[PDB]
Symmetry: C2
Subunit: 384 residues, 2 copies
């Protein structure tokens, strides 16, 4: 009711104000839209509290947020690259996950809670890294295609891991059987989506008893997510594949703009509500600060070697650009933390740590990647 | 959760299918988007049931639906007319309200429930009537401006009535004092909005600590609705005035399209959920059919004289065009019925009647108004 209408108004308003601040600070994405949630949240103001309704508008936020990403993914542009991206993607999953789990047990975690920190480090922000390259306008360059190409695959792998970890979360001590079934269910469904998505362009929706091409995209997006839930996979990342289907007809039917108008509404709520859950005790906690800073460096170095050994193919100057470029975590890492806390496998202390590092990784991207792209362009300006 | 994601998917899907059907039947608006709700609803299929979440997504639907209308209202175009529209608007409120209340007591209603049927007959669909004139492309003609101009004012008056009726609904036997306060609160707030809205064009949002002109429109829209609720006025119609503010800067900042992309998402849910609440007993009820058909004719004739005596100024040929043009009820009439049922002042039998006539009035508009506009154009083609 009007209880929540108010609450939403304070969420949107605070997010707008915090957004104007951070764009003026030249820190593009997924920072102020959280701290705005902290601000308007219980911890500081308390104009908004977490209700079941505002928890759902946070789901649609994450759903539409990854639906937008799945809509902007071209499977022509990626295939010309991804062989070298799939080398980075596998390293992108492998290196930081161990960094989370191994280091996690040393901070006194259990079996399950340790896996969640790893999965939180597995993810990569595909949204923020693209934003950085857009202003530079350098994205057309190949070393940018690898980073984004890997980031797409990596986020899909971050789902399957998270899905398995949650399968072990729901039911403890789960045998490898239920795990292996998710891996098969995931791979086939994705491959079927990829397979179907390639067959979409040849099939216009005109025969479908549909009232308009926008409506069908939505109805398909929510349906693809709901079906993913019935299979026992995260609905958030079940919509991303529903957008891969429509990514080829993206321009033809005029989708990208309106679907972004919806997403630009709901996506703020998701990032705020994640900030709402943060605590005063959580922020500035003596052990969290140390281990939070440490695990952050573990995340970077893991990505450096992962973005080097995997990107080693193209060049030295390029390999470094990929190592730093895969640094940001952002959206999915929150969908991990957000998922883990609600299942009850994530402690308030852990949630602080995850929200601590994602902030500092996103802070690190423009302060680092920006001069490197310049230096790579210089070396290529000589040898061309 | 995935319970509702599913439910939403069946709502959107059914609405899309029912929309393709009705557009093919040449019955433009707010018919299949309800019966789709009946279809997927308990009464027939039962894939969707009414939860608290899907009741809220029905509110945002009605909110964004009237926010869209308030955004498309120009206060330059209206002022050149409205003197003759305000003659129709007052008749538009006066005639059918008595038709509801007087006739209502004869069907065995009480004091309060009788007022709701009247208020349900007070409203006019501004959305459907505009749609009809768009295809004909005749809307630029003046006799179309009166109908729409009156329809805008009428819907604002339909709010204040409904607000008073609800004030008497919440607390029984309410003294004229609390009623008179709402009338003052309503008139001033609207006049202030109208006053402010005229002062908006001179003031671009550029100085506001805002991240983007879309975000501010939303945050303002929800805020204007939430503030309306705290005053004890329907939030649904508190957003309409928040869009009047932005109606002058409508084109400048590129709002109309994206805000319609959101509304084209949420607005279906509102019309479906209204259909969901309908009953098998409600549909095809022996007394409902009679009184439902009767009160429908009472609604038309009330609008005929109201759209004649008020529109009598321009011409005979035009006066008839207005009488029929004000026939459709649509959106707000549901917001009445929907409001009345939840407060508990509306019986299942009454809800049937209101949803019965709005269907038959909307059905009546194209089957009637269409040839009349032609005949008015012919008489004007001779005398020009």
């Amino acid at each position: 009711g009007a209880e929540h209408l108010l609450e939403i108004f304070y969420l949107l308003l605070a997010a707008q104000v915090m957004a104007f601040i951070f764009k003026r600070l030249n820190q593009p994405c997924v920072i102020g839209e959280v701290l705005a949630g902290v601000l308007v949240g219980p911890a500081l103001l308390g104009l908004v509290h977490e209700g079941e309704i505002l928890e759902f508008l946070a789901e649609l936020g994450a759903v539409f947020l990854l639906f937008m990403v799945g809509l902007e993914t071209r499977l022509k542009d990626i295939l010309a690259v991804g062989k070298e991206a799939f080398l980075v993607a596998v390293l992108g999953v492998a290196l930081p996950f161990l960094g989370g789990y191994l280091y996690g047990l040393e901070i006194g975690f259990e079996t399950l809670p340790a896996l969640f920190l790893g999965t939180a480090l597995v993810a990569t922000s595909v949204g923020c890294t693209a934003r950085v390259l857009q202003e530079l306008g350098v994205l057309s360059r190949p070393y940018s295609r690898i980073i984004l190409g890997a980031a797409v695959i990596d986020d899909v792998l971050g789902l399957i891991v998270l899905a398995v970890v949650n399968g072990v979360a729901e039911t403890g001590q789960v045998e490898v059987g239920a795990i292996t079934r998710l891996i098969v269910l995931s791979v086939v469904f994705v491959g079927l989506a990829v397979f179907l998505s390639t067959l979409i362009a040849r099939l216009p929706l005109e025969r479908l008893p549909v009232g308009s091409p926008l409506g069908f995209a939505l109805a398909l997006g929510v349906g693809m997510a709901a079906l993913a839930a019935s299979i026992g996979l995260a609905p958030i990342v079940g919509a991303f594949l529903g957008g891969m289907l429509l990514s080829e007809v993206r321009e033809k039917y005029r989708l990208e703009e309106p679907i972004f108008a919806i997403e630009s509404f709901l996506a703020p709520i998701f990032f705020a509500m994640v900030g709402v859950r943060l605590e005063l005790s959580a922020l500035a906690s003596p052990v969290v600060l140390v281990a939070g800073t440490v695990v952050t460096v573990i995340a970077i170095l893991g990505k450096v070697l992962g973005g080097f050994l995997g990107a080693l193919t193209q060049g030295v100057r390029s390999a470094l650009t990929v190592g730093v470029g895969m640094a940001p975590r952002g959206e999915v890492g929150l969908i991990v933390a957000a998922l883990g806390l609600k299942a009850g496998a994530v402690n308030e202390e852990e949630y602080a740590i995850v929200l601590f590092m994602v902030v500092f990784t996103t802070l690190f991207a423009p302060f680092a990647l920006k001069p490197l792209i310049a230096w790579t362009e210089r070396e290529r300006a000589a040898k061309e």
